[PDB]
Amino acid sequence: LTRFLGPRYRQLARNWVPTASLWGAVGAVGLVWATDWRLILDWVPYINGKFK
Amino acid sequence: SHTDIKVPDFSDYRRPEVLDSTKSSKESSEARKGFSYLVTATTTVGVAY
Amino acid sequence: RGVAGALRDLKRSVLCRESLRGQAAGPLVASVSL
Amino acid sequence: VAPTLTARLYSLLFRRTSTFALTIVVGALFFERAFDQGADAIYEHINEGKLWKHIKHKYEN
Amino acid sequence: TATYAQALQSVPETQVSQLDNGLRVASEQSSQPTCTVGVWIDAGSRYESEKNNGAGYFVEHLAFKGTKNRPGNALEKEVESMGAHLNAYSTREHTAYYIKALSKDLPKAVELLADIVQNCSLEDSQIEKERDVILQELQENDTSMRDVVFNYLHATAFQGTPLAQSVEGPSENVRKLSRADLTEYLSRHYKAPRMVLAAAGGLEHRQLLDLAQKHFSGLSGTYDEDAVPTLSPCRFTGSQICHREDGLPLAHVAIAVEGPGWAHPDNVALQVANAIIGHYDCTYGGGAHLSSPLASIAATNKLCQSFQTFNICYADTGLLGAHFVCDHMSIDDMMFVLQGQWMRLCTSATESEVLRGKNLLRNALVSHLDGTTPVCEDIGRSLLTYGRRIPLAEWESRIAEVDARVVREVCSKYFYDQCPAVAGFGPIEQLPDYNRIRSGMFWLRF
Amino acid sequence: TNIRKSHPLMKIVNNAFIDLPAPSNISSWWNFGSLLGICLILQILTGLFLAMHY
Amino acid sequence: AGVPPHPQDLEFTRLPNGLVIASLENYAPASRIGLFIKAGSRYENSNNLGTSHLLRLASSLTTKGASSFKITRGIEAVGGKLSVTSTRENMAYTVECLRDDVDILMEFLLNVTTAPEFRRWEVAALQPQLRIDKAVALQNPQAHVIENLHAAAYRNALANSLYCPDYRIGKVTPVELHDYVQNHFTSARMALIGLGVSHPVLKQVAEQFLNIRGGLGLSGAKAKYHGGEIREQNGDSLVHAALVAESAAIGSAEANAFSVLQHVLGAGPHVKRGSNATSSLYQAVAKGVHQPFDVSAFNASYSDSGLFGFYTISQAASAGDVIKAAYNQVKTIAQGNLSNPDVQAAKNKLKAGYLMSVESSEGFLDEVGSQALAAGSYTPPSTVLQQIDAVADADVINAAKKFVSGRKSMAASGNLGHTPFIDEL
Amino acid sequence: VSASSRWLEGIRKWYYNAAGFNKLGLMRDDTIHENDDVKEAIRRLPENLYNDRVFRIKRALDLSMRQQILPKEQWTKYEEDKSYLEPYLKEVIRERKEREEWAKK
Amino acid sequence: WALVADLLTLTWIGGQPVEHPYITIGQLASVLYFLLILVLMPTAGTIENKLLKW
Numbered sequence A: 001l002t003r004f005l006g007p008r009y010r011q012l013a014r015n016w017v018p019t020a021s022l023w024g025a026v027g028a029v030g031l032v033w034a035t036d037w038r039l040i041l042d043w044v045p046y047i048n049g050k051f052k
Numbered sequence B: 001s002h003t004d005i006k007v008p009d010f011s012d013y014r015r016p017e018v019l020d021s022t023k024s025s026k027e028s029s030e031a032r033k034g035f036s037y038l039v040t041a042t043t044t045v046g047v048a049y
Numbered sequence C: 001r002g003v004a005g006a007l008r009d010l011k012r013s014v015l016c017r018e019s020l021r022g023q024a025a026g027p028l029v030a031s032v033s034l
Numbered sequence D: 001v002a003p004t005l006t007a008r009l010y011s012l013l014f015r016r017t018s019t020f021a022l023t024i025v026v027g028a029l030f031f032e033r034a035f036d037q038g039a040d041a042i043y044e045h046i047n048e049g050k051l052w053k054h055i056k057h058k059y060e061n
Numbered sequence E: 001t002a003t004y005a006q007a008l009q010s011v012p013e014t015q016v017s018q019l020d021n022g023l024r025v026a027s028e029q030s031s032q033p034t035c036t037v038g039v040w041i042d043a044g045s046r047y048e049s050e051k052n053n054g055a056g057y058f059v060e061h062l063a064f065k066g067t068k069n070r071p072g073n074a075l076e077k078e079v080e081s082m083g084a085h086l087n088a089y090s091t092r093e094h095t096a097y098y099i100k101a102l103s104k105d106l107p108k109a110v111e112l113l114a115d116i117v118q119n120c121s122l123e124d125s126q127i128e129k130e131r132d133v134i135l136q137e138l139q140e141n142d143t144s145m146r147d148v149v150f151n152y153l154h155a156t157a158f159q160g161t162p163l164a165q166s167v168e169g170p171s172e173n174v175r176k177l178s179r180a181d182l183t184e185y186l187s188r189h190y191k192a193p194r195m196v197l198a199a200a201g202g203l204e205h206r207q208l209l210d211l212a213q214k215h216f217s218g219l220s221g222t223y224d225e226d227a228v229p230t231l232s233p234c235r236f237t238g239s240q241i242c243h244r245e246d247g248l249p250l251a252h253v254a255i256a257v258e259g260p261g262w263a264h265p266d267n268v269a270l271q272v273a274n275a276i277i278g279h280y281d282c283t284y285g286g287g288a289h290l291s292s293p294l295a296s297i298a299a300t301n302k303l304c305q306s307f308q309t310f311n312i313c314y315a316d317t318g319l320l321g322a323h324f325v326c327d328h329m330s331i332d333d334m335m336f337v338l339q340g341q342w343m344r345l346c347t348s349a350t351e352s353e354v355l356r357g358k359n360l361l362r363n364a365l366v367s368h369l370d371g372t373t374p375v376c377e378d379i380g381r382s383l384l385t386y387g388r389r390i391p392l393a394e395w396e397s398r399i400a401e402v403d404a405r406v407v408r409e410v411c412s413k414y415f416y417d418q419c420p421a422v423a424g425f426g427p428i429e430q431l432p433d434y435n436r437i438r439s440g441m442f443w444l445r446f
Numbered sequence F: 001t002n003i004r005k006s007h008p009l010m011k012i013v014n015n016a017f018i019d020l021p022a023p024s025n026i027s028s029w030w031n032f033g034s035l036l037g038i039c040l041i042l043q044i045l046t047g048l049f050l051a052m053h054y
Numbered sequence G: 001a002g003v004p005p006h007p008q009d010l011e012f013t014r015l016p017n018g019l020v021i022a023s024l025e026n027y028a029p030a031s032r033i034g035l036f037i038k039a040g041s042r043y044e045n046s047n048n049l050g051t052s053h054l055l056r057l058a059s060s061l062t063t064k065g066a067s068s069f070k071i072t073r074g075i076e077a078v079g080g081k082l083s084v085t086s087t088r089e090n091m092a093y094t095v096e097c098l099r100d101d102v103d104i105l106m107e108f109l110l111n112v113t114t115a116p117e118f119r120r121w122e123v124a125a126l127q128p129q130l131r132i133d134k135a136v137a138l139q140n141p142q143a144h145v146i147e148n149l150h151a152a153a154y155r156n157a158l159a160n161s162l163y164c165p166d167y168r169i170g171k172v173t174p175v176e177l178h179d180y181v182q183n184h185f186t187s188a189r190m191a192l193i194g195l196g197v198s199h200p201v202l203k204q205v206a207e208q209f210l211n212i213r214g215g216l217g218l219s220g221a222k223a224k225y226h227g228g229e230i231r232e233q234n235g236d237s238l239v240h241a242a243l244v245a246e247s248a249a250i251g252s253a254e255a256n257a258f259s260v261l262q263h264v265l266g267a268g269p270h271v272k273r274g275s276n277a278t279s280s281l282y283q284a285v286a287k288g289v290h291q292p293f294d295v296s297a298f299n300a301s302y303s304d305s306g307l308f309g310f311y312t313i314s315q316a317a318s319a320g321d322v323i324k325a326a327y328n329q330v331k332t333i334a335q336g337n338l339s340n341p342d343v344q345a346a347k348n349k350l351k352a353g354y355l356m357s358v359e360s361s362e363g364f365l366d367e368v369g370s371q372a373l374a375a376g377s378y379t380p381p382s383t384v385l386q387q388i389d390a391v392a393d394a395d396v397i398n399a400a401k402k403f404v405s406g407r408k409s410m411a412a413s414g415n416l417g418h419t420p421f422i423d424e425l
Numbered sequence H: 001v002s003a004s005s006r007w008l009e010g011i012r013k014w015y016y017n018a019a020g021f022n023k024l025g026l027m028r029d030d031t032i033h034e035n036d037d038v039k040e041a042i043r044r045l046p047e048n049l050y051n052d053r054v055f056r057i058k059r060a061l062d063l064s065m066r067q068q069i070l071p072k073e074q075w076t077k078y079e080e081d082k083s084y085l086e087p088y089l090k091e092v093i094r095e096r097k098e099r100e101e102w103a104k105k
Numbered sequence I: 001w002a003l004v005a006d007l008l009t010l011t012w013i014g015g016q017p018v019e020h021p022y023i024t025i026g027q028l029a030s031v032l033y034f035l036l037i038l039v040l041m042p043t044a045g046t047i048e049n050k051l052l053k054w
């Protein structure tokens, strides 16, 4: 449990933070696009084709 | 005798950026890889739709 | 790397007389390392 | 001449697989609207005056 | 009491001088009673054409067989009688002839090197004798799978260029090479601006420069004719060559990407990354506890008999990668673990292992420059490639600059998502397809 | 060594769809094996969604 | 200007317990420390053959002060090296690292040499490495010929092979390893040599840790020359053969005579692809033999005996013609046919080769370590050249005479259908 | 050393006889769950202790089949329970802890 | 067996109306369910390790 507490294991977290942050954007944008989530999509310029 | 083994000529198959044997291939590596991956990305964009 | 010194995987062939010189011994020594 | 567009597309978007995916999911969002908008415009043009949305204004009130 | 940093300052400066005919003369003095002296020429198979390929390797067989002033045995008897040793070698870019002898035998040693480089006899009776000798050596080299697989790697990686050519040349060119082809090769390439007289050991730089004026002055230099050689770039090609031979008991595999070349500062960081992966042999003692994950896994699961990383440097190009030999059912596992370590270092290298790679390099650099002959080689080769001797204190500065960020950036620049040149030989049915190898050069998780 | 080869589940998928040695010269008439698999799955999905209303 | 510093002298010290410390401060960036031990294969007997081979392979097993994991990772972390070199007389534990890390590798060296545990399971896991080590060594045909040459020459204690007999692989026990270290790794059988290290710290280390009192005294188990022949019919392409007679123990003046005789006859080339003009053995065989071959004088000098002769490589059908031609060439020197210029050129090859063999720290450390055990002293090179100059032409002749008249030992491997027995020479 | 430490030992002997693996002839280290550390320690046992462990487990599995136990005379006495595996398992754990401490740097 | 009897209690309470005192018993049995699995049974295994001296 406490094997992963040290300098090297914090360096590994540093190296994968830019990647893990991008997969979260891929998942987030993929969730908004797949469900047509209007809360987020209404703020995008070209996808305002709703005509409420 | 293995020094007789020359590699055949692939000039009929090489892309235009890779024809000159005196020009580095690094100058066109990004463009060549970008094209085939643009084909893959556009394909995934189509299947996603 | 392991070493065997005496001159004072199929390895290869030594056929001609030029490559043979130096092969004849001249006291064994066995070295081992990491 | 600077490197071609496909070269700057590779190093900037396609090198990392994570950005390669972010490019696709973002390209899928705009492609859907642009393709559905354009494709519907071709269907309605070929069928002008026949669909209900064309004869809709006659029966407003 | 002296620290490691202070010991790098104590190494004597390498004194460099140049004659009026372009011949550079370099030396590193010490207190030794012995010394090494030689001539490094900027010639090799990369300068040869397809018709005269192997000509330099032919001249190497004739360099010690007689001169105009010392015909036949006369050269050997002088070298042997003073207890000296005479040697030579030829790569794709450099040719060298050097003598090991006592310090008092310095003037005779330089005199012989001059008579060798300038006044080679090349008797027709001797050329026919060496014709059969080189042919036997070609048959001998065929049995060394390591020499074969690395010639294949050059053949496929630099296909269509001079670097694809091997040093020995093809069997047909050694049979039809005339004396005129060889003299044409000598007058064209053995020119004073392209040679370096290097020495190391107990000797003052003055007597070397005097002997340089005394014996090498009679050499056309600084303007031969409108026949100047110039090395053009050499195209690298992602490709694969597979010599299937199931009669051999172990497979040989060499895989590599394109390296930058001699002068690029990135070679230091690349060598640090290669040192982390390191090398393995079945006679190593460490086995499972080795630091390198590839070596540990290779020893624990017995994936190979050996592997080695390499960074081969040429002018503006090179071969960066690894070579291994293994059982026919371990070629896939070995390729998988190898590529996984390239990708791991490209993306997620850590600080401690990078320090190990820097320490392995510091020990390798100082252990190699121990003896007059290694230092004499470092002097000669560096003056041709770098145009100077890079002091050990400068190598330490460039090594100390490397950290984990440098390795991740530098490894990704040359490894990540790049087309390798693959060469295989032996029972290689299980060698992965090139597309699968090419897919191992990136990670979908990254 | 390799997770794809040693895991009890992935080794069956690996030895069937990934690392299976297949001939280098099978033509388009060998595509109908997978197409039959797709048709069977395609008929089951649509078949099930029709059973929610039939 | 560009000149080097003033080179220091080698410090040398004998402790009253028999230990020998010798150090040189060369101000190099690297340091090198060697512990040389009179524990080579000669101190095995017929009940523990191969124990010193397995010991040579066990340098990274667990010690009382450092586990096997720590030794491997600890040395590699600083980019260091740990080696074990063995001869029939000595074992040499050598350690290399940058001079800022001498303390770390010294601690590992002492643990490996003075506190090995030889754990039952670690030793068992290491047994198959004997088969791999021996197989890699014995693919040089020179190795097995010289194993058999010593097996044929001596009744005991040098007949013992450098490599473990096959029947012993897996049979060497941890008790035998413990007993081997307690008996032979003692103060009066050891020498602590160091480069890039100060003399006080070595002498300090020597007095703190290397004071192991003798479990077995300096053995008087003298090697007894007997002579004989071992022949190995195999499927090699060429016949290897060595013909030898008892010559002289190392350090004696008669040993220097045989070393000069070695270079009068020829031992290894000086020119890449050269005809070897100054080698009288090679020219003597090339007279009556026009096939590919090689021939070299063999010289092996030990503490209490020696073997001098020559080594031949030839086609199977030319094996007798090559051996008889070479042996006759030694007879002409024993009959007096030896010029003074011939002896001077031999002294130049010998004197030059000795100096060249100590250019490097690796070769210098090995020479100082061997001198410390063989002689209990350090003889500088200028004194060594002085001893070579003292060899007379008559001494070279009498050494040839001792070979011609001495009871021979012979080892050969190949297709031996035309390889003579000793009595046929 | 005192009357209270005999009561802690008293309940330990109670729990020992309540655990009941002594009724099958087993020892405490025979019952341990085999993880990677335990498997290595068992691998390092000398031949005699390995063969003894194998037969006790075999005899206990034979009893568990029949739903039987040994006579009380042949039960494992708490005072005689030999921790034959603990010194080997302590050393295996100590080595792993060292590998895990090097991995942190 | 406290987990079984506590589950036999939830079974009994489940087939009864939501009225006094079944409301309180059903809440106690519900907490006892998750407390036995998450807290008590793991703690017993640790106590048992100490009594055997490991």
Ligand SMILES: CCCCCCCCCCCCCC(=O)OC[C@H](COP(=O)([O-])OCC[N+](C)(C)C)OC(=O)CCCCCCCCCCCCC
Pocket (backbone or CB within 6 Å): A026, A027, A030, A031, A034, B037, B040, B043, B044, B047, B048, D014, D015, D016, D017, D020, D021, D024, D025, E417, E442, E444
């Ligand atoms: C709940 C909400 C969740 C929503 C999530 C939405 C996410 C949308 C997709 C984004 C993921 C992309 C992953 C990726 O891009 O990695 C897949 C792989 C890479 O491509 P690559 O090899 O260029 O390497 C790439 C090398 N680089 C990176 C250096 C350039 O993509 C390929 O290879 C395969 C492409 C071929 C497409 C056809 C597959 C479908 C199956 C058959 C369809 C027809 C019959 C059913």
Ligand code: HEM
Pocket (backbone or CB within 6 Å): F040, F043, F044, F046, F047, F048, F049, F050, F051, F054
């Ligand atoms: C090999 C797989 C299958 C085949 C070849 C198949 C074929 C057919 C065909 C040809 C029809 C006639 C449809 C029509 O004329 O309108 C039909 C009807 C039907 N099938 Fe399937 N089917 C398959 C699988 C399934 C499965 C797995 C289910 C249920 C989960 C299913 C549910 C139905 C239903 C509810 C109908 C009646 C609705 C209709 O007629 O469209 N089918 N099937």
Ligand SMILES: CCCCCC(=O)OC[C@H](COP(=O)([O-])OCCN)OC(=O)CCCCC
Pocket (backbone or CB within 6 Å): A035, A036, A037, A038, A039
């Ligand atoms: C896992 C199953 C999820 C089912 C969601 C669903 O079917 O779609 C509902 C909304 C529709 O978008 P909205 O802008 O009308 O929003 C209307 C809000 N009711 O989409 C969402 O908002 C997606 C939310 C994802 C959360 C996990």
Ligand SMILES: CCCCCC(=O)OC[C@H](COP(=O)([O-])OCCN)OC(=O)CCCCC
Pocket (backbone or CB within 6 Å): E439, E440, E441, E442, E443, E444
């Ligand atoms: C939801 C998205 C799932 C993504 C999985 C994926 O694409 O599989 C990997 C391959 C390409 O990667 P590679 O085989 O070069 O491996 C790279 C190793 N570094 O892609 C394909 O061609 C496989 C076809 C999948 C059909 C379902």
